[PDB]
Amino acid sequence: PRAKICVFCGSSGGASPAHMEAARQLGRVMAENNIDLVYGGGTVGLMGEVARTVCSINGPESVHGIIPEALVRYERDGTYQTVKDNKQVVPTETVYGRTTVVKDMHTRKKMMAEEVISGGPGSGFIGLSGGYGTMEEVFEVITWNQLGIHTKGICLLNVEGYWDGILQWINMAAAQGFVQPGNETIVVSAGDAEGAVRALREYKVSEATFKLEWGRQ
């Protein structure tokens, strides 16, 4: 079973080019380690960038985008050149990998989650630069890890201190005890693609609990 990484990132490119560049780099690194890509479909923004790179290196089979019905096209144009049997028009499979269309956002998130959880070793979630959506997804899979629904790691790829505020809040929450001891390590951060992939590889859920309650066992 190959390793799969779900990369939550923005639908927009971002002001500083370092975000797009980070998308490209993460793409290359994931592609070299034979890591298959799970992302929320589309051809725009950091998502489309990572998809484009990973697919460009390891072919369509290495990328699986999952798009809600509402974001589906019904005409062929530009980056959307591959048609489904139900006449749905979807991102060009040879450039952005395979694309599965689902009815709802809920089943979408659930499906990406599933595809990551069932993935091989080193599987996990990476949070690249994005807005409210990517954040919501990140904290969602965080909550799911917290509920013992999965055992995969979650790593924020910090481009020029973009996630600094969030790490800061995590610190504040662990300090005030709202994030219980042992849960602070659910999320890690990295400054580069290799760091993020390594983070997902070396992650073990029971690590923090081991540290906190082994001298206590």
Ligand X SMILES: O=P(O)(O)OC[C@H]1O[C@@H](O)[C@H](O)[C@@H]1O
Positions in the binding site for ligand X (CB under 6 A): 10-11, 40, 130-134, 137, 178
- Residue 129 contact, options a second copy, ligand X, none, Cβ 5-8 Å cut-off depending on partner type: a second copy
Residue numbers at the binding site for a second copy (CB under 8 A): 10, 12-16, 19, 106, 129-136, 139-140, 142-143, 146, 161-173, 175-180, 183, 186
Q: Which does 40 bind (CB under 5 to 8 A by kind): ligand X, a second copy, none?
A: ligand X
Min CB(131)–ligand X separation in Å: 3
CB-facing half-sphere around the CA of 39: CA atoms within 13 A? 36
Calpha distance 135→140 (Å, rounded): 8
**Residue whose CB is less far from ligand X, 60 or 133:** 133
Residue 66 · residue 44 · CB < 8 Å: no
Joined together, the tokens standing for residue 63 give 């990328």
User: Quick one: 34 or 146, whose CB is closer to a second copy?
Assistant: 146
Measured from the CB atom, the residue of 76 and 106 that comes closer to a second copy is 106
DSSP secondary structure, 187-214, as one string? EEEESSHHHHHHHHHS--THHHHHHHSS
Q: Which is nearer to ligand X, 2 or 106 (CB)?
A: 106
**Among all residues, whose Cβ is closest to ligand X?**
133
Which spans in the chain are helix H? Answer: 18-32, 45-58, 93-96, 105-117, 132-146, 164-175, 193-201, 206-212
Relative to beta strand 82-83, strand 89-90 is antiparallel
What the block records as the tokens of 208 is 């923090």
Residue 168 contact partner, candidates ligand X, a second copy, none, CB within 5 to 8 A by sort of partner: a second copy
The residue (of 95 and 139) whose beta carbon lies closer to a second copy is: 139
- Separation of alpha carbons 110 and 213, rounded Å: 32
Min dist CB 19 to a second copy, Å, is 7
CB of 121 to ligand X, least distance (A): 25
Q: How would DSSP label each residue in 76-96? A: -BTTB-EEPTTS-EES-HHHH
Min separation Cβ 140 and a second copy, Å: 6
